[PDB]
From a paper:
Here we determined cryo-EM structures of full-length human [name] in apo (PSS1apo), Ca2+-bound (PSS1Ca) and Ca2+/l-Serine-bound (PSS1ser) states, revealing how Ca2+, l-serine and an endogenous PC molecule are positioned in proximity to the negatively charged pocket to facilitate the base-exchange reaction. In the structures of PSS1apo, PSS1Ca and PSS1ser, we observed a PC molecule (PC1) positioned within the catalytic core, between the halve created by TM4 and TM8 on the lipid leaflet side. In the PSS1Ca structure, we observed a Ca2+ in the catalytic center and surrounded by acidic residues including E197, E200 and D221. The imidazole side chain of H172 directly interacts with the phosphoester group of PC1 at a distance of 2.9 Å. These interactions are not observed in the PSS1apo structure when Ca2+ is absent, because of the less well-resolved local densities for the headgroup of PC1 and the sidechain of H172, despite the similar overall map quality.
In mammals, PS is synthesized de novo by two endoplasmic reticulum (ER) transmembrane enzymes, [name] ([name]) and phosphatidylserine synthase 2 (PSS2). While PSS2 specifically converts PE to PS, [name] utilizes both PC and PE as substrates. [name] adopts a homodimeric assembly with dimensions of ~100 × 75 × 50 Å. The structure can be categorized into three functional domains: (1) the scaffold domain (TMs 1–3 and 9), which interacts extensively with its counterpart in the opposing protomer to form the dimer interface; (2) the core domain (TMs 4–8 and 10), which constitutes the catalytic center of both protomers, positioned ~65 Å apart and oriented toward the ER lumen; and (3) the PS-binding domain, comprising PH4 and adjacent loops, which create a membrane-parallel platform that accommodates two PS molecules.
Author numbering:
A (entry chain A), B (entry chain B): 14 to 140, 159 to 408
Write the structure that this text describes.
Amino acid sequence: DVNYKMHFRMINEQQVEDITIDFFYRPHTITLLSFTIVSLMYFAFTRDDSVPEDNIWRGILSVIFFFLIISVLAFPNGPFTRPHPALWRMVFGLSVLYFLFLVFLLFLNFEQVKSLMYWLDPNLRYAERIISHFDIFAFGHFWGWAMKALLIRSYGLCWTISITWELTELFFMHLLPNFAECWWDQVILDILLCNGGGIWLGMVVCRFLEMRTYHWASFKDIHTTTGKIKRAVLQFTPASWTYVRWFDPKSSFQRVAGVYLFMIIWQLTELNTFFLKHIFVFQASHPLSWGRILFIGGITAPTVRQYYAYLTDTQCKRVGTQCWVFGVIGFLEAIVCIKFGQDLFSKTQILYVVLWLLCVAFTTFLCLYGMIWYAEH
Amino acid sequence: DVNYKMHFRMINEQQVEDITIDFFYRPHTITLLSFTIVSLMYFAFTRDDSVPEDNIWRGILSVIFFFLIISVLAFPNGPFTRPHPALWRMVFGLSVLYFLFLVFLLFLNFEQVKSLMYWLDPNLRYAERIISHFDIFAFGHFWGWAMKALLIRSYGLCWTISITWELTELFFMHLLPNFAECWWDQVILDILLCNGGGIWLGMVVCRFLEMRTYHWASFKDIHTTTGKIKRAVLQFTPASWTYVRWFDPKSSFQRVAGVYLFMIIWQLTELNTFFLKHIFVFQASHPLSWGRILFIGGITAPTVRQYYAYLTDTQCKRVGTQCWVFGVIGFLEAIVCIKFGQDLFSKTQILYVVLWLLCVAFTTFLCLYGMIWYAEH
Ligand SMILES: CCCCCCCC/C=C/CCCCCCCC(=O)O[C@H](COC(=O)CCCCCCCCCCCCCCC)COP(=O)([O-])OCC[N+](C)(C)C
Ligand SMILES: CCCCCCCC/C=C/CCCCCCCC(=O)O[C@H](COC(=O)CCCCCCCCCCCCCCC)COP(=O)([O-])OCC[N+](C)(C)C
Ligand SMILES: CCCCCCCC/C=C/CCCCCCCC(=O)O[C@H](COC(=O)CCCCCCCCCCCCCCC)COP(=O)([O-])OCC[N+](C)(C)C
Ligand SMILES: CCCCCC(=O)OC[C@H](COP(=O)(O)OC[C@H](N)C(=O)O)OC(=O)CCCCC
Ligand SMILES: CCCCCC(=O)OC[C@H](COP(=O)(O)OC[C@H](N)C(=O)O)OC(=O)CCCCC
Ligand SMILES: CCCCCC(=O)OC[C@H](COP(=O)(O)OC[C@H](N)C(=O)O)OC(=O)CCCCC
Ligand SMILES: CCCCCC(=O)OC[C@H](COP(=O)(O)OC[C@H](N)C(=O)O)OC(=O)CCCCC
Ligand SMILES: CCCCCCCCCCCCCC
Ligand SMILES: CCCCCCCCCCCCCC
């Protein structure tokens, strides 16, 4: 009750501790009101509004910007408080915008969605060997895996997800057999080098952060210029690292089911990315692909932390709002891919779709024994 | 600091006191997660999306519906906690929807706004004596004035703004001289009966509610059926009524200028209503006209109590988020009228627009002496 609302406030709206420069946190919401009104007056009395399409585009951009401002004013900032809670409020505002956009798309038919996508960018309408495969997107995949390893902190989770998803991508070759590819490309380059290296780097960084002691001093008290610069740059780094062990030695059935649902939703997000790219046929270099991946990772970090907090802490009896929104976003992307994807499906074998559900369950069951037996030894 | 955040929480997120039926307040945000996903699955796989135009309409309704659900989870509930804080989160969720809508319109040109309005309702494109003037809108205008009187509790405000607006509504006859009307339409029917009668009814309600003692008991503890029914209907009535006195006997210049801004923004909302009807031609009977007045009426109730809290209590050092949004909405509607209204502007004398600014200042200055001198006697 009294603790419940406080325990949930530690998941939704984490407060900033040890505020030295009070200027950075004192609200000035009336100044924000004046700024918004004056900006709208300028953009309404000086802008040129003779072109319809550009008017619609700029209106959409302005609506997004001022929804971000409203999110700063009202929305919660998750379990994170660096560099500033306003940033995570803005990320939550983007999450809500995306969730509503996905809600809208479920009512338009395929022709209307295609027309909207062509409106977003008209160019869509027209649309040894080891060394060559490395690219910027391999860099992105590796760094995303590193961030996931940082946030999850379990080899038996990240590796299970990596192997399962790589095998699913290999199995879904029949959807797009035109492209010239081999199993080795999506086995070695991904499981061994990209995903493996990302997981290793993330794990070593998490190990460092867990045993690092945090001695955040006031930016004002520091005297030397190099010290001030170091304090400024180190702010973007986390101020603390929670001790994340998913599997208790005496874990109950509820905890195992929670971790299983976590892994299932992770694979669902990977599947949503794959099938969105497949159905709406934009290249990986297109902003609608890598921008969405970046946004999903930025959502994923606080969502992972909130899901861990809800699953472990027995005092927390409400799931955080960002984790809720991420769950809705993942499931709505799955529904969108289902609804708009019946054209490419011919003789769907869900027998493989059932297959990793047991294979994840078998592996998350060996994770228990692999630790329960190791706990004895 | 510690009190500041606590005191602002009393304006933004008022908590429910003496919770007896805990069922009505226990969150079930995972059940709300399963409800939306299952709801969209039904509307995505069973609905017929062959009509391009009706898909956009139902999509807009769905986005609005699922922004209320997000607003229930995240947005604050103002200074009000009856009949349930969720309702006042949905009412806030409409304010953010409406405020962002006005941000969009400030970039569209007059042809697109008209084209958008005809889309909402295609019928817009084509578009003794005392007893006869009474109508349903006189009922609304009276009850709107009665509702305001509850939240203000001062004759020297509700009458100053009633008198000075009715003369400003009457002075604007030159803008629309086609309609056959006389000065006595807005002199006896409104100033004396509609507005004057509404204020009197509103004031006697406050006189009752302020000296009424509140003895809210458990709904379960009540035994008789008539008592249970009486308790249920009585929930929609307020649980408490704060003693509001705008003018302190020793009021400072910051307080007088605080009330002066309240009087000015009140006219602006009255001025916005008159103009956007005149600019975008639609009659009062249209749902685009009376629908907006009902929404602004519901928005006004928490905004007045948040503005009063900010004005008086020296501990409150942040204006509530609902009072912030209503300030932006009341101004964006004025910018919208200015940008799209230059066609009717021919030889505008802002001399009368300056005129009530002094006339309100003179009357809000006599309100001081009218109370300061009465305080001595
Ligand atoms: C057609 C296809 C065919 C194949 C289909 C295959 C189907 C396969 C089968 C799948 C079935 C799996 C069933 C698992 C049930 C778990 C129940 C359980 O343990 O309860 C709880 C956990 O579970 C929860 O409820 C947690 C919150 C979830 C809600 C937010 C969603 C956001 C997700 C985003 C997640 C993040 C993802 C990040 C991504 C990187 C724990 O019990 P509790 O007592 O509530 O917890 C105690 C804690 N308190 C309450 C005391 C504080
Ligand atoms: C230029 C723009 C305006 C400038 C002034 C600004 C004022 C802004 C306005 C504010 C008032 C909001 C009400 C708008 C009036 C509705 C339009 C109308 O007359 O059409 C009726 C809708 O009848 C219904 O069935 C209503 C369904 C639920 C309500 C949805 C309304 C939109 C969101 C409101 C929810 C609250 C959100 C915030 C509230 C502020 C009848 O039409 P229909 O039977 O649907 O006929 C089908 C034709 N189409 C439309 C499908 C093609
Ligand atoms: C071209 C046309 C020509 C004609 C133009 C005519 C121009 C006419 C000229 C107008 C000039 C009037 C200027 C007066 C400024 C005085 C300010 C003042 O005293 O500060 C504060 C009040 O003022 C505020 O700042 C309050 C919050 C306002 C922001 C939210 C707006 C929402 C409105 C929604 C209104 C709802 C309406 C509902 C209606 C039914 C008080 O001082 P403070 O020290 O901050 O307060 C102490 C308390 N704390 C801080 C210690 C806690
Ligand atoms: C660009 C700024 C450079 C860095 C300037 C700098 O010194 O930042 C310090 C401030 C916070 O200063 P404190 O050390 O009191 O808060 C810290 C808190 N008590 C804790 O340790 O948790 O950072 C921000 O607000 C965010 C700034 C960035 C806004 C995007
Ligand atoms: C401009 C943005 C710069 C990037 C800002 C940045 O990295 O800081 C975000 C958080 C900071 O975490 P806190 O210090 O608030 O607490 C942490 C919390 N108590 C915990 O338990 O971990 O770190 C991550 O999530 C790092 C993962 C990658 C995130 C992308
Ligand atoms: C339809 C319900 C009929 C009325 C049924 C009824 O008995 O309501 C009681 C509940 C709350 O009951 P309490 O007296 O414990 O809370 C009140 C608090 N202790 C106080 O006094 O402030 O009211 C609602 O949630 C109303 C939601 C209505 C749905 C919006
Ligand atoms: C379905 C909706 C039914 C209508 C519900 C209704 O009337 O309740 C809303 C509030 C109730 O106020 P509280 O009891 O939360 O506290 C009051 C606060 N502490 C104070 O200081 O006043 O009353 C008004 O604003 C009445 C004005 C008219 C509002 C339209
Ligand atoms: C949480 C962070 C969200 C970041 C969103 C990234 C989207 C960027 C899109 C850029 C498009 C550029 C086209 C030229
Ligand atoms: C705060 C309460 C908001 C209520 C909004 C009222 C809008 C109703 C519009 C109904 C249109 C009906 C057209 C047939």
